[PDB]
Amino acid sequence: WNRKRISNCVADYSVLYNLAPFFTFKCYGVSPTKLNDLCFTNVYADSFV
């Protein structure tokens, strides 16, 4: 697993909500519509098939 420790940035997922080739958006612990105003130390990104 490639744990990408992304830091020192603000989440901007509203592009993916505004584009066709991204389909599912599920969030647990935080709201799926309230993602933009959250701040984190290290977001751990993983991407698989």
Binding site: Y17, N18, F23, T24, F25, S31, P32, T33
Partner: protein, 50 residues
């Protein structure tokens, strides 16, 4: 059933029983449920193993 999507904060002691689809995206839902058209009423399905 628990509400998770609503347009604004509610004034104290008020009732919302509208079951219309929340307009998350710019596209109108028009009675069609999908992604960026979120239904407000959801349940956590309480179980004794929780």
């Amino acid at each position: 059933l628990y509400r998770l999507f609503r347009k604004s904060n509610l004034k104290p002691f008020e009732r919302d029983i509208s079951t219309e689809i929340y307009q998350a995206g710019n596209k109108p839902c028009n009675g069609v449920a999908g992604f960026n058209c979120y239904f407000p009423l959801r349940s956590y399905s309480f179980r004794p193993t929780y």
